Amino acid sequence: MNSITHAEFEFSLLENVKYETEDEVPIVLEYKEEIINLIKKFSNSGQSGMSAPITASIITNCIKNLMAFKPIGPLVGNEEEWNYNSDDSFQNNRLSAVFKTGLNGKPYYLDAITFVGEEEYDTFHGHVEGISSRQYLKGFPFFPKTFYINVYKDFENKDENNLCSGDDGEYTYRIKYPEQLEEVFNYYDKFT
Amino acid sequence: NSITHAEFEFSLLENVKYETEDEVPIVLEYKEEIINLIKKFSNSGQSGMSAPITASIITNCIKNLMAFKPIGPLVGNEEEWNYNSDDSFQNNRLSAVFKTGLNGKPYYLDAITFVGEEEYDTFHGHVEGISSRQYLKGFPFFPKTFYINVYKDFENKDGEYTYRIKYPEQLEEVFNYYDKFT
Amino acid sequence: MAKRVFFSFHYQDVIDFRVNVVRNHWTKLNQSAAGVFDASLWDAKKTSDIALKRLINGGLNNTSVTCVLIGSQTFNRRWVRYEIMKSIEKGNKIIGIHINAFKDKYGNIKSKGPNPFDYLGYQYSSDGKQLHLYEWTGGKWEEYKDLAPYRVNQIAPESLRGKFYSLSSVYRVYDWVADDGYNKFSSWVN
Amino acid sequence: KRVFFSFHYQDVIDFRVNVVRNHWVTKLNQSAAGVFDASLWEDAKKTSDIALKRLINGGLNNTSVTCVLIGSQTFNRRWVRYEIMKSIEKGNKIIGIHINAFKDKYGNIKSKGPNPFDYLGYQYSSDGKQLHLYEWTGGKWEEYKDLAPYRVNQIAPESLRGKFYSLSSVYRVYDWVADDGYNKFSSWVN
């Protein structure tokens, strides 16, 4: 109790509002008890002003990874980390969007790149100008990272070999900032 | 339930034999609270599309509360200040925010952290007329800390060096977010 | 010519990996909706369920097929039911695919989960101009709270009014193994 | 002219520390500030207490004064004791300041905390070349585990060897109210 004044007050601000519809209730209120219990344990662990932001970052990074079915630390890639109950592609047990084709195949990650269009909500996995969402791991230990690559729709200079459709006609997606790809391929190896 | 993946991850950490106490991962101390949060999340009816949104809301809320930051922006209304002081009135929800006098301009002590070239040379202070505290532009206020790189100038100092701003372009973003404190 | 699918599945570790097996098979001409949300850019007061619906709705607007991936508990998960019901309103093609037969690391599978289309339905109003939605929950058919009845552009004939239709009588459900999804998955969407 | 602010992590202490920081204003005032983000590549492998010790050690090494801000439970907190013990090994000037009397918005204050320097101590080795550290764990003095014995340059005379001494006589403790911190805080550091 002696350490939750701030957190309890922040939740009280959300609770003291009259919500016309249930759809308007803030999502975090569902998790008040579990969040407060985490704050309590953290506040009773003997942290100092200087040690607390480190510990807090470790905790919250753990939660974020586990909620996304990502490992707590890096993938090791050793023999036990793979599911061999498939004919061709072996799936990683700890990060299931990682696969390798063959026992000694080069592992790749389905979620390496999410493409981000110019219009709100136009975010997708796919292929844009020979850049796929899946990319090769450089090796192990592997720390997963997703890169968000901006794209735009080219209506004038379309390419019939890869067109898209919509309420605005035919177009092909193009990489908007090619320099963003250099960061990707300092992290991954290009999948072709 | 959907904690097999999380319990496996924790088991990997617990089953290692650590030579010293200092090597034991810190997250193990919070396993029960983390698992209980995952359990509640797993039972909330999430879809593949909805889960990352909900997860981001939860973890960003936890991040804020662990830093004693508000979970939304400051409003700056009368109820948000602590009036039991003579000079500087402190914000109740983000306590590094102060205003000198009831009509003073609110400022934020954590607006800028300076980052030197040496590892661990990170500090609050004053570098070439740039202070760690900066004025809020107004309310609603969304807290943000800028990390400004600095370097030690031993050549042209004014007891051996003078700190200087490494990338002046970094200060352009700062003062699009804050107003300069002088 | 490229098409984008909305993958509707529920969140659980034991079926996320099975979904990823499907994703590992779905090319240049194949896109899928993906979220990008970052709660740190924007206010926990504003991130409510209507904000969630707006992001799901917007993602759905850039797709033409909703493909429900079915595991053991998919049938009764709130946000999967919303994605299916909103897909109907937007006129997406909708299919279901059982994916419980992908083996885990011990070689185990699970039996087919119940068809989510069995737990959702609709009924036309007596004047034929409004579509009322229902979900099976709490032991009976409840008016669907997550999406209000809406007007339809084409009047339903009197023979179709006041009659309950479950979604399983409208949308096809495949079995990845029995129906050779490995070779025919593209033909189910396209 | 950089201070290491040593205080225990709690919301009711953090706001009181910020009142003090709001008086360490001048251009010749600096304080150590932590920078850590486990989500980035630089900090992705820092997971245990040794990473905490290395960052604290590094931040301490760039200061010359350690200022312990004292609340009700500060004497008992593990990482505050570590910062104090490490400050001794590095030869920092160390002071303590009671900050319990700053009122919150309702007028609440905290009871005065015990002197953290009362719960820590040392003893010179028999040959006078090594400093052994101790802490009060509730009912007895125990060897300090978080920091191993180290060698000192002052060979230490026989009158001090094998004799236990608490830190309470070594370092000055101020009261913000009684000792007029509003006018004298800067003089206590410099």
Query: DSSP letter string over C62-83?
Result: T-SEEEEEE-SSGGG-HHHHHH
Q: Is the minimum CB–CB distance between B53 and chain D shorter than 8 Å?
A: no
CA C171, C172, C175, C178: dihedral to nearest 10 degrees?
Answer: 170
Residue the block writes with tokens 């030869």: D91
Q: Determine the distance in angstroms separating the CA of A89 from the nearest CA of chain D, rounded to an integer.
A: 29
Instruction: Say if strands B97-100 and B88-91 run parallel, antiparallel, or are unpaired.
Output: antiparallel
- What region does B127 belong to: left with phi over 0, alpha with psi -120 to 50, or beta? beta
> What's the DSSP call for residue A161?
T
CB within 8 Å: A55 and B6: no
Longest dimension (CA), chain C: 56
Structure token digits, residue A167: 């309420």
CB within 8 Å: C27 and A89: no
Structure token digits, residue C45: 């007061």
Against chain B, the chains showing at least 3 CB pairs within 8 Å are A, C, D
First-to-final CA distance of chain A: 56
User: What Å distances lie between residue A35 and A16, B12, B72, CA to CA?
Assistant: 19, 25, 16
CB atoms within 10 A of CB A117: 17
Q: Tell me the angle at which helices A32-43 and B31-42 cross, rounded to the nearest 10 degrees.
A: 170
Backbone angles phi, psi at C182, to 5 degrees: -55, -35
Cα separation, A25 vs A11, in Å, equals 12
CB within 8 Å: C56 and B48: no
Residues 6+ apart with CB under 8 A from D130: D124, D149, D150, D151, D152
Residue D65: which H helix or E strand, with range?
strand D65-70
Reported structure resolution in angstroms: 1.8
Against chain C, the chains showing at least 3 CB pairs within 8 Å are A, B
Domain regions of chain A by residue span: 5-67, 79-189
Question: A–D contact (≥3 CB pairs within 8 Å)?
Answer: yes
In A38-78 the beta strands, taken as DSSP E runs, fall at none
Residues 6+ apart with CB under 8 A from C4: A124, A126, A164, C31, C32, C33, C62, C63, C64, C65
Of B63, B71, B72, the CB nearest to A60: B63
Cα separation, D118 vs D169, in Å, equals 9
Q: Tell me the angle at which helices A5-15 and A32-43 cross, rounded to the nearest 10 degrees.
A: 170
D58 touches D50 (CB < 8 A): no
- Burial classification of residue D42, based on how many CB atoms lie within 10 Å of its CB (0-12 exposed, 13-18 middle, 19 or more buried): exposed
CATH class for the region spanning D2-115+170-189: alpha beta
Alpha helices in chain D (DSSP H): 11-21, 49-61, 78-90, 181-189
Of B25, B96, B131, the CB nearest to D47: B25
User: Experimental method for this entry?
Assistant: X-ray
> Which of B177, B179, B104 has its CA nearest to residue B145?
B177
- Burial classification of residue C114, based on how many CB atoms lie within 10 Å of its CB (0-12 exposed, 13-18 middle, 19 or more buried): middle
Of D33, D35, D49, the CB nearest to B26: D49
Residue A114: which H helix or E strand, with range?
strand A113-116
Q: Which amino acid is at A37?
A: N
Against chain A, the chains showing at least 3 CB pairs within 8 Å are B, C, D
Listed by number, the residues of chain D in 152-171 with a beta carbon closer than 8 Å to a beta carbon of chain B are none
Q: Best interface-test mutation with C: which of A32, A84, A91, A158 has the largest number of C CBs within 10 A?
A: A91
The helix/strand/coil state of B91 is strand
